Design a protein around this ligand. Structure first.
Ligand code: MG
Ligand code: MG
Ligand code: MG
Ligand code: MG
Ligand code: MG
Ligand code: MG
Ligand code: MG
Ligand code: MG
Ligand code: MG
Ligand code: MG
Ligand code: MG
Ligand code: MG
Ligand code: MG
Ligand code: MG
Ligand code: MG
Ligand code: MG
Ligand code: MG
Ligand code: MG
Ligand code: MG
Ligand code: MG
Ligand code: MG
Ligand code: MG
Ligand code: MG
Ligand code: MG
Ligand code: MG
Ligand code: MG
Ligand code: MG
Ligand code: MG
Ligand code: MG
Ligand code: MG
Ligand code: MG
Ligand code: MG
Ligand code: MG
Ligand code: MG
Ligand code: MG
Ligand code: MG
Ligand code: MG
Ligand code: MG
Ligand code: MG
Ligand code: MG
Ligand code: MG
Ligand code: MG
Ligand code: MG
Ligand code: MG
Ligand code: MG
Ligand code: MG
Ligand code: MG
Ligand code: MG
Ligand code: MG
Ligand code: MG
Ligand code: MG
Ligand code: MG
Ligand code: MG
Ligand code: MG
Lengths: 64, 51, 76, 52
RNA sequence: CUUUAAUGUUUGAUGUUCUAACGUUGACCCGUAAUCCGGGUUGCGGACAGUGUCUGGUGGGUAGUUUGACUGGGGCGGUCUCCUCCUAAAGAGUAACGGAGGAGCACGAAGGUUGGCUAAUCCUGGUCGGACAUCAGGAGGUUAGUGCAAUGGCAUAAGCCAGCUUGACUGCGAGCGUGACGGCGCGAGCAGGUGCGAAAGCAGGUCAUAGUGAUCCGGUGGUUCUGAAUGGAAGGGCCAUC
RNA sequence: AAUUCCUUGUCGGGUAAGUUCCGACCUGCACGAAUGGCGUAAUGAUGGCCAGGCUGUCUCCACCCGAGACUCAGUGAAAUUGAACUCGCUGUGAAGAUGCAGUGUACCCGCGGCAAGACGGAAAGACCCCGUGAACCUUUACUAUAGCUUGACACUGAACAU
RNA sequence: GUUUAUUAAAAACACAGCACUGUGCAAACACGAAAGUGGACGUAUACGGUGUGACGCCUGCCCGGUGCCGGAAGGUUAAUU
RNA sequence: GUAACGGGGCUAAACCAUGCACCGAAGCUGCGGCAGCGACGCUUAUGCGUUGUUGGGUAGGGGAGCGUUCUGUAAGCCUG
RNA sequence: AGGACCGAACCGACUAAUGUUGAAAAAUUAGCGGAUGACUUGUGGCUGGGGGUGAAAGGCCAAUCAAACCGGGAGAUAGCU
RNA sequence: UUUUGUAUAAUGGGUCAGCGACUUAUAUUCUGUAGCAAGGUUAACCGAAUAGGGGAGCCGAAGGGAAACCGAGUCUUAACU
RNA sequence: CCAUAGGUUAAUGAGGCGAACCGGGGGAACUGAAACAUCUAAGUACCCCGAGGAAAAGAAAUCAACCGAGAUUCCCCCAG
């Protein structure tokens, strides 16, 4: 049968031009006020999926 | 002889755990991937030459 | 017992030694209190982290009445 | 922890606000500070409000 | 508007009396050779009882399960996150139910900047006033001080006082540090707007290192991002934030 | 004390000597009145203790009668078993050796016997621990639920009085 | 008297007796989706449940806790409107 | 059961201090053989006085093979 | 008269020995308890598995019972050997 | 076999013979190989039918951004050296 | 009292069996989630009813999107 994508991971990772995957930073949901503005500012932009984690994202997204 | 059934003691996961690099097809990082950071032989400077 | 607790080591010490070429903004040493003091072309962070304010070679020197240890950058 | 978080709302009406904390036992008077408003790109006076 | 007296209306609350629903495991008749059942007659009960849906309470009566780990076996006791010193063998790192202590905050000033200032302790005098209050002088030289543990630091003070203040700024960020990762930390400089200085300049909180909690779900504000025929909207997204 | 941890409590009786028994003492660790208290004739393959009789129970075994065991003939199993040319000692060694080291002893092979060893045989240890095992059982563990119970509506109407 | 057929026959269970409590008979209760049946072709001198366990002498104090029973003014409170 | 030189035995066959021998391993060196790999000489899909060097091995990774049954080759070939 | 006495049949199963790859997957031998009763027994019938039945031991329910047996889900699952 | 470690007095096996365990389907990634190549390839189905037809589709040649959008750029920001 | 219930005849029809497939009425748990409640397993196993050679479905109060398509069933895509 067709492989089923992990739908939770498909809603959080997008494939990039060179095959990478971008995801949003953690730690920015509901305890952010006590965090310095510089810390929040660095967490706002999108990030690249790490070399250690490359296999898991691709595994969750086999068709994309 | 890993990944061969329940009786083997390494079945249904093949000793690979739950959704890690070792359980994925073609997964695992090669030697020296250091999480995203420039590895130690690059934070640190190169030195010497072969004569 | 009521002990057996510690914190992760923070990896202080000298990262770039004497005579090493560094880029501007590179931190030379991370410390607790001014073990080293900032000299020429060297800045001091809010946690006493000394960083390079210019490109050049790292030089350690001892000057002044207090016999303190200073870090300076010779920008060629 | 008995100090409670508050929000400082800009008076310019942009709707931008900052958040901080204040001691309720002392300093009953409202907090007034001049802070930068990104919407109008100017430093304006921010007034204390209630987080909700 | 109040105070409302009466007035019809519309819903209920009881109480009383009915019969016609309904009940009869009352009597009698028939089906009928029948202690079933059905029908008829009659009596009694009666808008209850009883049953259905919904709903509150109760419910080991009956089910499906949970009931942690580390640990000089286990149980009991203790411990589980974070900070400081030692252990740690002069880079980094380094364990034990090893040796010692702390944290789950506080502060719109205890922040920023400018200007100024320098301590403990002791001695000698001096109303009440004493071992110790404020005064004067001397010695001392940080043996003090640092919002709070410990270590390091601090006189250019990071300590103390005064003036003016909100940079406890927004968008960013070269280059670094440290983590397996999630992540955490440092950062010159750039843009826009500030504050203090005459200016050079300094300010992206606090001497530094503890004062903390991922994701999902839901809440709040903002937003021409989306809007399942179209215009809206709902909802979702993004930003701020609980 | 079916209840007393200290404990063989203390005293008395019984014995030559009684941690048991019997009588008291009360200091009831931690009895107690229908989860009954105390007594109680009779009953008991009931528990404990004592006496007489009686005896090979014993001091201390002896003999005898039978059935096996032993021999012959016939029939003819079983559990077990890596392979064996299967000695002692001391030491070593997955830390208790027929098999290793050293050394001693021992002609080859049956039969009747005894069980010290072969960590003998039997049965993937019942004790202990572990697994994010199983099952039953308990409850003011959690979530439900049968049942029970409450009200509304429906089956279900009329009249009158407040 | 009964009991662990196959390691336990007992001081265990039962027992007569006693007390509490429920039950008015289309009885309570129990078995049954229900009909029905048992209870009982019985009717409180009856039946069910519970504990105690002949007989003798007796069975004291506590209703705070937990249940049960009674009360119903007030507080709180579902479906519904 | 001697049981604290392995035993015998030893007054040096012990110990101390100097030597020169010898024994001693699958180490090393010889003389053959096989295989992997590296840069060369010519030639190089082949290979050549090649040469240098390597070749203990579980988990595990890489590479190359043997044999078995069946299908094609095969209405061929082997066979009273 | 008697859940009276002694004691065969009958029924029970307290002690000891044997037996334990047995004559026997619970018996035999010598003793033992009850033996007109809550006795015992024949032949039929009824109660069915979260159920029965139980003078109550978690006993018994076809040599199997803290949830019978048979088939199915089912090649349950087994971080263990 | 399992172990830091077994002649171990740890597990397994009386012996022989036979049988007895890395497979299958689909999808996906990587390597090798073959074909074509900025293109490659068809699936069902049709079809005298392993051909041929069928390009329905799929992957690739363009990305950035949550998205609208823009596009060898794009996002971030008022704007980015 | 007619009636009705009921009763007696006479005609037809049905009863049961049988593999799977089908429609409908009921309907698990183990398991997976590395526990376990929602969820999964699964409307599967199983039970029951009914029918046929097929059954079921079926001739738009359907989709589309401002252009249009034109009952149902089945296959490949769309698409994990
Ligand atoms: Mg597999
Ligand atoms: Mg493994
Ligand atoms: Mg339960
Ligand atoms: Mg379950
Ligand atoms: Mg544990
Ligand atoms: Mg555990
Ligand atoms: Mg060191
Ligand atoms: Mg170090
Ligand atoms: Mg100053
Ligand atoms: Mg200060
Ligand atoms: Mg300050
Ligand atoms: Mg719409
Ligand atoms: Mg005692
Ligand atoms: Mg005495
Ligand atoms: Mg006594
Ligand atoms: Mg008592
Ligand atoms: Mg009592
Ligand atoms: Mg007695
Ligand atoms: Mg005597
Ligand atoms: Mg032997
Ligand atoms: Mg030995
Ligand atoms: Mg021996
Ligand atoms: Mg013998
Ligand atoms: Mg013997
Ligand atoms: Mg044994
Ligand atoms: Mg066991
Ligand atoms: Mg008796
Ligand atoms: Mg028995
Ligand atoms: Mg019996
Ligand atoms: Mg017995
Ligand atoms: Mg009793
Ligand atoms: Mg009483
Ligand atoms: Mg009470
Ligand atoms: Mg009371
Ligand atoms: Mg060699
Ligand atoms: Mg190997
Ligand atoms: Mg053949
Ligand atoms: Mg053939
Ligand atoms: Mg009698
Ligand atoms: Mg008798
Ligand atoms: Mg008798
Ligand atoms: Mg049985
Ligand atoms: Mg069960
Ligand atoms: Mg079965
Ligand atoms: Mg299954
Ligand atoms: Mg299995
Ligand atoms: Mg293994
Ligand atoms: Mg060995
Ligand atoms: Mg052995
Ligand atoms: Mg074709
Ligand atoms: Mg096309
Ligand atoms: Mg760019
Ligand atoms: Mg599970
Ligand atoms: Mg037909």
């Amino acid at each position: 049968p067709k492989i089923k994508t992990v739908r939770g991971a498909a809603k959080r990772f997008k494939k990039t031009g060179k095959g990478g995957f971008k995801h949003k930073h953690a730690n920015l949901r509901h305890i952010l006020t006590k965090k310095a503005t510089k810390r929040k500012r660095h967490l706002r932009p999108k990030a690249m999926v790490s070399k250690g984690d490359l296999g898991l994202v691709i595994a969750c997204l086999p068709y994309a | 002889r890993l990944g061969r059934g329940i009786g083997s003691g390494l079945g249904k996961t093949g000793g690979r755990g739950h959704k890690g690099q070792k359980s994925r097809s073609g997964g695992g990082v090669r030697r020296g991937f250091e999480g995203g950071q420039m590895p130690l032989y690059r934070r640190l400077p190169k030195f010497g030459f072969t004569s | 017992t009521r002990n057996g607790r510690d914190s992760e080591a923070k990896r202080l010490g000298v990262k770039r030694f004497g005579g090493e070429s560094v880029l501007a903004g590179s931190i030379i040493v991370r410390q607790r209190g001014t073990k080293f003091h900032a000299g020429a072309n060297v800045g001091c962070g809010r946690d006493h982290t000394l960083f390079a304010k210019a490109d050049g070679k790292v030089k350690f020197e001892v000057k002044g009445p207090k016999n303190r240890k200073f870090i300076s950058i010779e920008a060629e | 922890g008995i100090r409670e978080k508050i929000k400082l709302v800009s008076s310019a009406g942009t709707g931008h606000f900052y958040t901080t904390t204040k001691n309720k036992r002392t300093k009953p008077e409202k907090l007034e500070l001049k802070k930068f408003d990104p919407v109008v790109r100017q430093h304006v006076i921010y007034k204390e409000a209630k987080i909700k």
